[PDB]
Short mmCIF file of C-alpha atoms in Angstrom, two decimals:
data_model
loop_
_atom_site.label_atom_id
_atom_site.label_comp_id
_atom_site.label_asym_id
_atom_site.label_seq_id
_atom_site.Cartn_x
_atom_site.Cartn_y
_atom_site.Cartn_z
CA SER D 90 19.25 -13.92 8.25
CA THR D 91 18.20 -10.97 6.13
CA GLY D 92 16.53 -10.30 2.81
CA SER D 93 16.54 -7.35 0.42
CA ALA D 94 14.37 -6.96 -2.66
CA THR D 95 13.70 -4.16 -5.12
CA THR D 96 10.10 -3.01 -5.48
CA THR D 97 9.04 -1.39 -8.75
CA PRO D 98 6.02 0.81 -9.61
CA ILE D 99 3.53 -0.95 -11.87
CA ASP D 100 2.79 2.19 -13.91
CA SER D 101 3.74 5.84 -14.38
CA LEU D 102 1.51 6.98 -11.48
CA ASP D 103 2.92 4.66 -8.77
CA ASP D 104 -0.52 3.07 -8.44
CA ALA D 105 1.13 0.07 -6.77
CA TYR D 106 4.54 -1.58 -6.44
CA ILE D 107 5.56 -5.13 -7.36
CA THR D 108 8.35 -7.16 -5.80
CA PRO D 109 9.63 -10.47 -7.22
CA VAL D 110 9.02 -13.49 -4.98
CA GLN D 111 10.34 -17.02 -5.50
CA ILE D 112 7.79 -19.77 -4.77
CA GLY D 113 8.41 -23.51 -4.86
CA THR D 114 11.08 -25.82 -6.15
CA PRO D 115 12.37 -25.12 -8.76
CA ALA D 116 11.55 -21.49 -8.11
CA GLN D 117 8.53 -19.92 -9.77
CA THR D 118 9.02 -16.16 -9.65
CA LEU D 119 5.83 -14.11 -9.29
CA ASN D 120 5.61 -10.35 -8.92
CA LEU D 121 3.59 -9.66 -5.77
CA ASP D 122 2.09 -6.53 -4.24
CA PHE D 123 3.50 -6.29 -0.71
CA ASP D 124 0.60 -5.06 1.42
CA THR D 125 1.10 -3.94 5.03
CA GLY D 126 -2.70 -3.59 5.21
CA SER D 127 -3.54 -7.27 4.82
CA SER D 128 -2.24 -10.63 5.96
CA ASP D 129 -2.74 -13.18 3.14
CA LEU D 130 -0.11 -14.29 0.64
CA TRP D 131 -2.22 -15.26 -2.36
CA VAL D 132 -1.32 -15.87 -6.00
CA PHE D 133 -2.79 -16.36 -9.41
CA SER D 134 -2.37 -20.04 -10.09
CA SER D 135 -3.06 -23.02 -12.32
CA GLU D 136 -6.33 -23.29 -10.36
CA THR D 137 -7.58 -19.78 -11.17
CA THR D 138 -10.67 -19.73 -13.41
CA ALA D 139 -9.22 -19.38 -16.89
CA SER D 140 -11.42 -16.45 -17.95
CA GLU D 141 -10.15 -14.53 -14.89
CA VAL D 142 -6.47 -14.74 -15.89
CA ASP D 143 -5.26 -12.11 -18.40
CA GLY D 144 -1.48 -11.94 -18.60
CA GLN D 145 -0.48 -12.71 -15.01
CA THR D 146 2.21 -15.22 -14.17
CA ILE D 147 0.69 -18.18 -12.34
CA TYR D 148 1.91 -20.50 -9.62
CA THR D 149 1.50 -24.18 -10.54
CA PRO D 150 1.83 -26.23 -7.34
CA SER D 151 1.98 -29.50 -9.25
CA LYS D 152 5.32 -28.37 -10.73
CA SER D 153 6.84 -27.68 -7.28
CA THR D 154 8.45 -30.64 -5.53
CA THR D 155 8.04 -28.86 -2.18
CA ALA D 156 4.34 -27.93 -2.53
CA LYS D 157 1.87 -29.70 -0.25
CA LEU D 158 -1.89 -29.21 -0.17
CA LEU D 159 -2.98 -27.79 3.18
CA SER D 160 -5.88 -30.20 3.39
CA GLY D 161 -9.27 -28.64 4.05
CA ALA D 162 -8.01 -25.07 4.11
CA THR D 163 -9.81 -22.34 2.18
CA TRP D 164 -9.48 -18.58 2.06
CA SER D 165 -11.59 -15.63 0.98
CA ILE D 166 -10.70 -11.96 1.21
CA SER D 167 -12.34 -8.64 0.40
CA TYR D 168 -10.32 -5.46 0.23
CA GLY D 169 -11.23 -1.89 1.07
CA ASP D 170 -11.58 -1.05 -2.63
CA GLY D 171 -14.26 -3.72 -3.13
CA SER D 172 -12.00 -6.24 -4.84
CA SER D 173 -11.83 -9.84 -3.69
CA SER D 174 -10.33 -13.29 -4.22
CA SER D 175 -10.66 -16.80 -2.84
CA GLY D 176 -9.36 -20.33 -3.17
CA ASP D 177 -7.47 -23.14 -1.46
CA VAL D 178 -4.05 -23.34 0.16
CA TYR D 179 -0.69 -25.03 -0.30
CA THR D 180 2.41 -24.84 1.83
CA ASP D 181 5.65 -24.26 -0.05
CA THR D 182 9.06 -22.62 0.15
CA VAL D 183 8.93 -18.86 -0.39
CA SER D 184 11.95 -16.59 -0.78
CA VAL D 185 12.11 -12.79 -0.90
CA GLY D 186 15.38 -11.08 -1.68
CA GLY D 187 17.43 -14.04 -0.46
CA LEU D 188 15.38 -14.70 2.72
CA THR D 189 13.75 -18.13 2.63
CA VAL D 190 10.75 -19.42 4.59
CA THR D 191 9.83 -23.08 4.42
CA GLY D 192 6.25 -24.17 4.98
CA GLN D 193 4.75 -20.81 4.06
CA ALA D 194 1.02 -20.83 3.36
CA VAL D 195 0.59 -19.95 -0.32
CA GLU D 196 -3.06 -19.18 -0.98
CA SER D 197 -3.97 -20.34 -4.48
CA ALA D 198 -6.71 -18.31 -6.13
CA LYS D 199 -9.62 -20.17 -7.65
CA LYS D 200 -11.49 -16.90 -8.21
CA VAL D 201 -10.41 -13.27 -8.44
CA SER D 202 -12.51 -10.16 -9.00
CA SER D 203 -12.36 -8.12 -12.17
CA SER D 204 -9.90 -5.50 -10.93
CA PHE D 205 -7.31 -8.21 -10.38
CA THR D 206 -7.90 -9.83 -13.77
CA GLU D 207 -7.66 -6.43 -15.43
CA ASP D 208 -4.22 -5.70 -13.92
CA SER D 209 -1.75 -7.96 -15.70
CA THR D 210 1.23 -6.64 -13.71
CA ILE D 211 0.23 -7.99 -10.28
CA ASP D 212 0.47 -11.78 -9.83
CA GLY D 213 -0.81 -11.76 -6.24
CA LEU D 214 -0.42 -10.12 -2.85
CA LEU D 215 1.99 -10.70 0.02
CA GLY D 216 0.39 -9.51 3.23
CA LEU D 217 2.50 -7.87 5.94
CA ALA D 218 -0.12 -6.85 8.52
CA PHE D 219 -0.61 -8.92 11.64
CA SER D 220 -1.45 -12.59 11.27
CA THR D 221 -4.68 -12.14 13.22
CA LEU D 222 -6.18 -10.82 9.95
CA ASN D 223 -5.25 -13.86 7.87
CA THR D 224 -8.37 -15.33 6.26
CA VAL D 225 -7.42 -19.01 6.02
CA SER D 226 -10.03 -21.30 7.56
CA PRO D 227 -10.31 -23.41 9.65
CA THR D 228 -6.68 -22.90 10.72
CA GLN D 229 -5.44 -19.33 10.39
CA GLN D 230 -1.99 -19.05 8.82
CA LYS D 231 1.03 -16.85 9.52
CA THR D 232 2.36 -14.14 7.24
CA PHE D 233 5.75 -14.42 5.56
CA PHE D 234 7.18 -11.92 8.07
CA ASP D 235 5.74 -13.78 11.06
CA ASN D 236 7.28 -17.03 9.79
CA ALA D 237 10.65 -15.42 9.07
CA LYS D 238 10.84 -13.33 12.24
CA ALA D 239 12.67 -15.76 14.52
CA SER D 240 15.40 -16.29 11.90
CA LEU D 241 15.93 -12.60 11.18
CA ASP D 242 18.87 -10.69 12.61
CA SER D 243 16.33 -8.17 13.96
CA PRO D 244 12.52 -8.67 13.90
CA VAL D 245 11.87 -5.81 11.49
CA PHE D 246 11.16 -5.00 7.88
CA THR D 247 11.48 -1.67 6.13
CA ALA D 248 9.64 -0.06 3.22
CA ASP D 249 11.52 2.47 1.08
CA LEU D 250 9.13 3.19 -1.79
CA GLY D 251 10.28 5.34 -4.68
CA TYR D 252 8.56 8.29 -6.31
CA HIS D 253 8.31 7.35 -9.98
CA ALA D 254 11.23 5.00 -9.38
CA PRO D 255 12.10 1.65 -7.81
CA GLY D 256 12.60 1.27 -4.08
CA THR D 257 13.41 -1.46 -1.58
CA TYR D 258 11.88 -3.82 0.95
CA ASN D 259 14.43 -5.07 3.49
CA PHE D 260 13.88 -7.79 6.08
CA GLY D 261 15.89 -8.23 9.26
CA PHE D 262 18.03 -5.08 9.21
CA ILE D 263 17.82 -1.28 8.99
CA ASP D 264 19.97 0.18 6.17
CA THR D 265 21.39 3.28 7.84
CA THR D 266 22.49 4.63 4.43
CA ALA D 267 18.91 4.73 3.14
CA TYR D 268 17.64 7.74 5.08
CA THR D 269 18.72 11.15 6.34
CA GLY D 270 18.67 12.37 9.91
CA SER D 271 17.21 10.09 12.57
CA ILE D 272 14.31 7.62 12.65
CA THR D 273 11.44 8.66 14.91
CA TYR D 274 9.55 5.73 16.39
CA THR D 275 5.90 5.84 17.42
CA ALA D 276 3.56 3.44 19.18
CA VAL D 277 1.46 0.87 17.31
CA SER D 278 -1.89 -0.62 18.24
CA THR D 279 -2.47 -4.13 16.91
CA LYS D 280 -6.09 -4.26 18.14
CA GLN D 281 -7.48 -4.12 14.57
CA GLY D 282 -4.68 -6.23 13.08
CA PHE D 283 -3.08 -3.25 11.31
CA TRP D 284 0.06 -1.18 11.74
CA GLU D 285 -2.09 1.46 13.40
CA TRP D 286 -0.49 4.59 14.86
CA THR D 287 -1.35 8.20 15.73
CA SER D 288 0.10 11.08 13.75
CA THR D 289 0.65 14.26 15.77
CA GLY D 290 -0.73 16.70 13.17
CA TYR D 291 -0.27 18.25 9.77
CA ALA D 292 0.64 21.32 7.75
CA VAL D 293 -0.40 22.45 4.27
CA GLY D 294 2.39 23.93 2.19
CA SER D 295 4.32 26.56 4.14
CA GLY D 296 1.44 26.94 6.59
CA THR D 297 1.61 26.56 10.34
CA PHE D 298 1.58 23.07 11.79
CA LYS D 299 -1.74 22.04 13.35
CA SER D 300 -1.24 19.79 16.36
CA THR D 301 -4.00 17.18 16.33
CA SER D 302 -4.07 13.41 16.80
CA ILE D 303 -4.83 11.47 13.60
CA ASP D 304 -5.18 7.71 14.10
CA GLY D 305 -4.50 5.72 10.95
CA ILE D 306 -2.76 2.75 9.40
CA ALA D 307 0.49 2.42 7.47
CA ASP D 308 -0.71 0.63 4.33
CA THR D 309 1.67 -0.04 1.43
CA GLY D 310 -1.20 -1.71 -0.45
CA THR D 311 -3.26 1.50 -0.73
CA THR D 312 -2.22 4.08 -3.33
CA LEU D 313 -3.45 7.32 -1.77
CA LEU D 314 -3.49 9.20 1.54
CA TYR D 315 -6.95 9.11 3.15
CA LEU D 316 -7.49 11.58 6.00
CA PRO D 317 -10.39 13.23 7.87
CA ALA D 318 -12.58 15.50 5.77
CA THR D 319 -11.50 18.58 7.76
CA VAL D 320 -7.82 18.00 6.95
CA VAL D 321 -8.48 17.19 3.29
CA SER D 322 -10.66 20.29 2.82
CA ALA D 323 -7.91 22.46 4.34
CA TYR D 324 -5.41 21.00 1.87
CA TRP D 325 -7.48 21.39 -1.30
CA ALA D 326 -8.62 24.89 -0.33
CA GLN D 327 -5.05 25.97 -1.15
CA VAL D 328 -5.37 24.76 -4.77
CA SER D 329 -7.30 27.15 -7.01
CA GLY D 330 -10.13 25.37 -8.76
CA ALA D 331 -9.92 22.18 -6.74
CA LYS D 332 -13.23 20.64 -5.75
CA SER D 333 -14.74 17.39 -4.56
CA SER D 334 -16.57 15.67 -7.41
CA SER D 335 -19.18 13.08 -6.48
CA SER D 336 -19.22 11.81 -10.08
CA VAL D 337 -15.47 11.24 -10.20
CA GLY D 338 -15.28 9.98 -6.62
CA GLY D 339 -13.11 12.50 -4.80
CA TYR D 340 -11.14 15.70 -5.06
CA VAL D 341 -10.01 16.81 -8.50
CA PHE D 342 -7.98 19.85 -9.48
CA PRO D 343 -6.93 21.66 -12.65
CA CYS D 344 -4.02 19.89 -14.26
CA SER D 345 -2.44 23.34 -14.74
CA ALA D 346 -2.13 23.81 -10.96
CA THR D 347 1.02 23.55 -8.87
CA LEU D 348 0.24 21.59 -5.72
CA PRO D 349 1.45 22.50 -2.23
CA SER D 350 3.30 20.02 -0.07
CA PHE D 351 1.62 18.22 2.81
CA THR D 352 3.42 17.61 6.11
CA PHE D 353 2.44 14.98 8.67
CA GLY D 354 3.75 14.64 12.20
CA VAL D 355 5.46 11.61 13.71
CA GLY D 356 6.00 12.53 17.33
CA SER D 357 7.97 15.77 17.22
CA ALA D 358 9.32 14.94 13.75
CA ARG D 359 7.82 15.95 10.42
CA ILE D 360 7.55 14.12 7.08
CA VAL D 361 7.06 16.35 4.04
CA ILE D 362 5.14 14.98 1.05
CA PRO D 363 6.11 17.13 -1.97
CA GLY D 364 3.23 18.55 -3.97
CA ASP D 365 4.17 16.54 -7.06
CA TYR D 366 3.54 13.31 -5.12
CA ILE D 367 -0.12 14.37 -4.76
CA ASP D 368 -0.75 14.62 -8.55
CA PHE D 369 -2.39 11.45 -9.92
CA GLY D 370 -2.90 12.81 -13.38
CA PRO D 371 -5.87 13.23 -15.69
CA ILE D 372 -9.10 11.57 -14.57
CA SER D 373 -9.39 10.18 -18.12
CA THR D 374 -6.99 10.32 -21.03
CA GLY D 375 -6.67 13.88 -22.32
CA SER D 376 -8.70 15.48 -19.53
CA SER D 377 -7.54 18.74 -17.93
CA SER D 378 -9.05 17.60 -14.61
CA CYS D 379 -6.51 15.76 -12.47
CA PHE D 380 -7.12 13.36 -9.61
CA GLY D 381 -5.86 14.27 -6.15
CA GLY D 382 -3.64 12.05 -4.05
CA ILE D 383 -5.09 13.21 -0.72
CA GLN D 384 -8.69 12.10 -0.27
CA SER D 385 -11.26 11.96 2.49
CA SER D 386 -11.48 8.86 4.69
CA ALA D 387 -15.00 9.79 5.83
CA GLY D 388 -16.54 6.82 3.98
CA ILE D 389 -13.85 4.28 4.94
CA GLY D 390 -14.00 4.21 8.73
CA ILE D 391 -10.22 4.52 9.13
CA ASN D 392 -7.51 6.94 8.05
CA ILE D 393 -4.95 5.40 5.70
CA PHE D 394 -1.32 6.44 5.25
CA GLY D 395 -0.98 4.83 1.83
CA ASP D 396 1.84 5.03 -0.68
CA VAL D 397 1.50 8.81 -1.22
CA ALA D 398 2.59 9.29 2.39
CA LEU D 399 4.88 6.31 2.84
CA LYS D 400 7.01 6.95 -0.24
CA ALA D 401 8.05 10.29 1.28
CA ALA D 402 9.73 8.37 4.11
CA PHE D 403 11.92 5.47 5.08
CA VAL D 404 9.52 3.39 7.17
CA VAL D 405 10.46 0.78 9.78
CA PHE D 406 7.90 -1.90 10.68
CA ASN D 407 9.26 -3.09 14.02
CA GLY D 408 7.79 -6.49 14.87
CA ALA D 409 9.28 -6.82 18.32
CA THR D 410 7.03 -8.17 21.07
CA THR D 411 5.69 -4.63 21.41
CA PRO D 412 5.55 -3.44 17.80
CA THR D 413 6.38 0.12 16.77
CA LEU D 414 6.67 2.13 13.55
CA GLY D 415 9.63 4.32 12.60
CA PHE D 416 9.72 7.15 10.07
CA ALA D 417 12.73 8.99 8.69
CA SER D 418 13.13 11.50 5.92
CA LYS D 419 15.19 10.44 2.94
#
């Protein structure tokens, strides 16, 4: 089997991408944030505290003839940005782009933090990291990809995120028309539960490539590119007037500036992030200070190849017995 679904930016800055997902019988379609940095499929639901729902579409398990309470199971998750959610669990039929999994754990939110309530465009998350990170207790549950894997033509999914445009998540096949040149594959460590890999270096603009190992994760659920402070300083030093602002929370730059590209290495190959992908716009409406899309990871504990980096590439998440990541230009 295969599946193929369009993913659409939630706003004009590509802050996140939503993909329609069919849950239950008859289908209830919710727009979920596919997140290769986490491993829970959770939704706003008829059980979510009413004051914490503000425009989202909810899953109502009582209206699904295939929903079953997973008795005794609870979940609770906290994300790198400080947001969180928790609740109980049903199993139900879940389909993405024509690919159907029966008995998928659907984590029903009883509580969500304010950032989720305040974003009416995201109805939940669909985690695509390794199932060892799933938070369901006392019996950890498998991700959608883990459940679908055996049925897929090939045990892979691909992320093809658009810049200011829709893109595609495919499951079970690699669309050879969706990229240019060849795909370069690189080793993955699953020891932390992430799609963790080692970039071979970077370049700023037309500058010389610096060969240096940068361990980080491929995370579709994080907006920006978070890299070591040395690398980030070298980038922003090429933008006149750019500075790190403690009050804003990272590097800002004059909105009048033209940004240089940023290149990252995948083995001997190179992925170029155009400068315009690094512009996240005014820090507040009408401001001439703009927020940068490359930020320091020094306070995170891990480097993160978020959407800024991934949307410059066609990315293969190879879930074979020994997983690997592939990157191609497009």
